[PDB]
Amino acid sequence: PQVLQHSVDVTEEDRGPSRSNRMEMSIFYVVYFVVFPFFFVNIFVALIIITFQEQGDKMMEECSLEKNERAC
Amino acid sequence: PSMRPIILVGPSLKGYEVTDMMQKALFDFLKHRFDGRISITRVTADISLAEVQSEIERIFELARTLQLVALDADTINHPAQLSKTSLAPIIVYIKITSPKVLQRLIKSRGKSQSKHLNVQIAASEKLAQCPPEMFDIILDENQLEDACEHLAEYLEAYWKAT
Amino acid sequence: NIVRKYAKKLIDWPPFEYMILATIIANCIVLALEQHLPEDDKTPMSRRLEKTEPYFIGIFCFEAGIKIVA
Amino acid sequence: LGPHHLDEFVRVWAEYDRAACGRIHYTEMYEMLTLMSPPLGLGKRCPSKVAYKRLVLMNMPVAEDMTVHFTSTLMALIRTALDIKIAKGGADRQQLDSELQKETLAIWPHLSQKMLDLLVPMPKASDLTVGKIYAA
Amino acid sequence: TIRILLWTFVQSFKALPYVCLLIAMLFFIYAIIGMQVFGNIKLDEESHINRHNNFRSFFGSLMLLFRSATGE
Amino acid sequence: CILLVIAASSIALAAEDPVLTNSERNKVLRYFDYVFTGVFTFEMVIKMIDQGLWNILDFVVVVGALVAFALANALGTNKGRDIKTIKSLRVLRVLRPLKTIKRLPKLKAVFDCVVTSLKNVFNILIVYKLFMFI
Amino acid sequence: QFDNILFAVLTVFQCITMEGWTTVLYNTNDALGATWNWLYFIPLIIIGSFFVLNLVLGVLSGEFAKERERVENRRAFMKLRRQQQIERELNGYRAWIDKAHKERLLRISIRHMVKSQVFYWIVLSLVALNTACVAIVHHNQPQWLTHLLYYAEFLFLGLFLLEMSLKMYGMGPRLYFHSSFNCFDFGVTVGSIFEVVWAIFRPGTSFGISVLRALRLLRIFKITKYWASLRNLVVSLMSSMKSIISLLFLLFLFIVVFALLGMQLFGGRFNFNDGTPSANFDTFPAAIMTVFQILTGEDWNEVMYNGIRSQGGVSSGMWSAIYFIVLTLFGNYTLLNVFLAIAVDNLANAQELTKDEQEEEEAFNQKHALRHHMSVWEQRTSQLRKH
Ligand SMILES: CC(C)CCC[C@@H](C)[C@H]1CC[C@H]2[C@@H]3CC=C4C[C@@H](OC(=O)CCC(=O)O)CC[C@]4(C)[C@H]3CC[C@]12C
Ligand SMILES: CC(C)CCC[C@@H](C)[C@H]1CC[C@H]2[C@@H]3CC=C4C[C@@H](OC(=O)CCC(=O)O)CC[C@]4(C)[C@H]3CC[C@]12C
Ligand SMILES: CC(C)CCC[C@@H](C)[C@H]1CC[C@H]2[C@@H]3CC=C4C[C@@H](OC(=O)CCC(=O)O)CC[C@]4(C)[C@H]3CC[C@]12C
Ligand SMILES: CC(C)CCC[C@@H](C)[C@H]1CC[C@H]2[C@@H]3CC=C4C[C@@H](OC(=O)CCC(=O)O)CC[C@]4(C)[C@H]3CC[C@]12C
Ligand SMILES: CCCCCCCCCCCCCCCC
Ligand SMILES: CCCCCCCCCCCCCCCC
Ligand SMILES: [Ca+2]
């Protein structure tokens, strides 16, 4: 928010701010959030959940017949 | 005959751009890979009706030179439609394994063919219901390399046998 | 109360339910344009937009009536 | 069916064992299954013969006292519900039971042969199995 | 149902004694680093290296990394 | 026996005083630092005699210690701004807790699980780094 | 302060949301003593916030795997796996169409060159300079750069217009928009022209959509074995796009209603004698972007102190902590739920789609032309498919 506030309160190159000017520069920060914190970070959490391998499973075809529901 | 003639069929009716280009690409492969061993002939007479018989010995006398010939027919589009002649060709089948790819292919090939989609689809269905053993070779492969190697290896087997 | 021959269920035609979805989006823009000033103060624009409330109620109250009938 | 749907068997035993009758009499084998719900209990709504012959497919052995074993009873409910090496009938059922014993050792060798045969009864056919009791 | 969620998820924190030791070694390494490198900054209450938040001690810097890990 | 020197030297890092450089605690701990690095070298040399030429990380730590103890004890002065040199060569000692990653066959199996999971998200951590660049 | 029970289940809800949990910890170190307080707050952040992400991620992840195997959700995936088969085999069947004055003399050799493998590595070695020309524009950059990089648009805009022609007047206007990134190429070539014109009429803000051409460097993945994994992600994201767009729009109709409701309660009431904060509720653009602070949950704290002293103080006006609690609790876990369902449904599809290529194109045909390291998600979602 302190970067949103400065990015809104913006006037020109080598000029001090002016509050609530350029309030349309808050679209750069909702399009950034919808992409990187919401979408992309949840691609990382989901490529690790989806592609997670059991630590060690080398017990005769991993207990050839008896498996997760069958063994436990 | 000395060498069994090569005749291609299966996508759709000949004359349509789809089957025309399919066969012409396959024959370009045959030429530029086997350059100096196969002579390509274009046929405009109805072989099934055997000037009709004027070209049959012409095919023979290129087939009577210990060399393979590819038959660019333009009226035969069925295995049973040539079950009567004594040519005994090798029937390589350029197979399409789904109607949907067929409609997409014909539609994507301009708009002049788009007015003839239904008839080509019907003839392709008719070909599909034909029994598989009526074709000497099956080519349902997608990549040019795969079907080219398949046909090349079969022709190589024939050439080593004779 | 349950009287048939509504002649109202026939009114739920597709030209009729895309004007309610048009008055709602219009309504959602009037609410978007209002600015809230501290102590009974009102901007001149927000005094104009307060004149549309009888219309938006007029349409939304029409729908309840025509639906509780149909 | 999972370990969730199996603690019920531990629970439902308690209301009719009352810390005493672990050799529980076999009348409850129908009563217990109706009380419970699928996928462990048969259920009280539709006990239909094709549904119930799963219990006949679950050829639980009986002793001289018309009694069953808690450990043995628990496995047979598992084995039919999870379709673990379940055959249609005949000695081919026991042919897979040899594996049913064998597979256990390579996983849990800590079990003896009695408790192996407790987990895999391999009932002898001439005895009236629980399924055969109610099939007759 | 609240106890099985707790039981199931705390049993699987007991099957991974070493996964919460690479994380406790990340917090160890950084801590040490912050000590030698950031340890002699003079505390100024205007800044965020306060008397509360600093690198002057192992536990004073382990709290700085936990305060920072939790996004604060 | 090595693995306890690893875990006793890594606590000699957590006890040092960052501000009071020459406190009495730091004077003792700078006698331990010779003892701990003496063990590591005579665990490296016998290892490199009996194996021939992770072990780079061990190699760096022992050299970084000797170089620090050499140029500080030998002269320590007469070079431009060389107090910062040992102060930046002793930050290599922080790698001593990292020597235990491969000494424990079960901790190494967890480190190789993080690395193997950093390679699954790597063709998306390049798309992420390219969208974050646009 | 934990004065009451209602003042304590809000000071501890603040710390679990991990907003300002250190000012709470640093107050009770001054007030009481810094020896025992850490036993209250570290076990509270770990259990309350970290250990509840583990449960929420786990409970959600299992729920998304049980729903992927619903009959209504396999039926709509096999209908996606099918059109991927058609498109895959049709590509080979369009490869066979390999036809061997200026109507047929230039348009024959152009499309020969402009599809050659030395052409791609020219454009992608020339879009890797356009994305390093606009990567060095800093502030106060030397005067030679400002002019040098000023021509660097026109050299690149003109040249990328040159290759926009060879794909149009050498391969076809109608037969120009059949590829995805080929439509992307048009999207920014007109877009880059728009910046040029718009900057002459209004010098200043130059948001500059010509670095969007850097998205063609993603096609360097085609030369790697990581194209199937990545194309199947976009193929799955594009198929389920009317359900992501109509799901970002229900996450926007609940930001609006809330923003609206936030103006009714705190509109015009943030005129404090210090000055109205930047996180107002007075106008709609400022009410939307402070509900977006509370949803993403960062400094929902400070917006609540203003919203409490707005309606009174720590007094008859602290009933307004319900707005900032219901809204940072149902946006902390509703954005995670929505945006992880989008990223798990469309990412477990791109894991079976890229697996039914290797398991056909390298297992099914390679034979008929003559487990095995399955993750926990893959095994458990196959036992759930076999019921
Ligand atoms: C495929 C991904 C990587 C593309 C990401 C870019 C777009 C999705 C976003 C990112 C930044 C956004 C822009 C950020 C700011 C502005 C300026 C805004 O208008 C202004 O403020 C310009 C004039 C002025 O400053 O007065 C109009 C929307 C726009 C172009 C936004 C439109 C959407 C953009 C291009
Ligand atoms: C998932 C877990 C089991 C992995 C291992 C634990 C870690 C998550 C670390 C990161 C933050 C660490 C904490 C950061 C700060 C402190 C305060 C510290 O406090 C003191 O010694 C005195 C008071 C002060 O901090 O000033 C005691 C250790 C402790 C609780 C640390 C214990 C170990 C923690 C929880
Ligand atoms: C808590 C233990 C079990 C952890 C494992 C490591 C310990 C066996 C040893 C290894 C090195 C030891 C340190 C070596 C030297 C010193 C200096 C010693 O003397 C002082 O500096 C005190 C001076 C004063 O009284 O002001 C205080 C303990 C301490 C930090 C020792 C604390 C205990 C340590 C960490
Ligand atoms: C090929 C692409 C993907 C990467 C290109 C490199 C840029 C991402 C970075 C790397 C180094 C950066 C430079 C590092 C240091 C400086 C000095 C600094 O500027 C000054 O020296 C201040 C005075 C002035 O020149 O205005 C900031 C800009 C600049 C040129 C940076 C500009 C952007 C650069 C070239
Ligand atoms: C406050 C004076 C008028 C400001 C007008 C700004 C218009 C653009 C608003 C952008 C922020 C709202 C984004 C909505 C979607 C999240
Ligand atoms: C046929 C297109 C292939 C593209 C290959 C690279 C794709 C990388 C993933 C792109 C994800 C974009 C998400 C944008 C934000 C919603
Ligand atoms: Ca925060």
Residue numbers in the entry:
A (entry chain A): 1375 to 1446
B (entry chain B): 227 to 276, 301 to 412
C (entry chain A): 76 to 145
D (entry chain A): 1736 to 1871
E (entry chain A): 1592 to 1663
F (entry chain A): 1158 to 1210, 1222 to 1302
G (entry chain A): 291 to 390, 460 to 729, 772 to 788
Paper text:
Voltage-gated calcium (CaV) channels mediate calcium influx to cells in response to changes in membrane potential. The so-called pharmacoresistant (R-type) CaV2.3 is widely expressed in the brain and enriched in the hippocampus, cerebral cortex, amygdala, and corpus striatum. High-voltage-activated R-type CaV2.3 channel plays pivotal roles in many physiological activities and is implicated in epilepsy, convulsions, and other neurodevelopmental impairments. Here, we determine the high-resolution cryo-electron microscopy (cryo-EM) structure of human CaV2.3 in complex with the α2δ1 and β1 subunits.
A total of 2096 micrographs were collected. In our structure, the intracellular gate was determined in its closed state, in line with the observations from other voltage-gated channels. Moreover, the closed gate of CaV2.3 is further stabilized by the W-helix from the DII-DIII linker, which is consistent with a previous study on CaV2.2 and indicates that CaV2.3 also adopts the CSI mechanism. The W-helix in CaV2.3 (772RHHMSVWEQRTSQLRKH788) is a positively charged short helix and positioned underneath the intracellular gate, with W778 inserting into the gate and forming extensive interactions with residues from surrounding gating helices. VSDI, VSDIII, and VSDIV in the activated state and VSDII in the resting state were also determined in both CaV2.3 and CaV2.2. The cryo-EM map of CaV2.3 is of high quality around S4-S5II, and we identified a single strip-shaped density that does not look like a PIP2 molecule. Taking a closer look at the structure, this negatively charged region forms electrostatic interactions with the positively charged R590 on S4-S5II, as well as R371 and R378 on the AID.
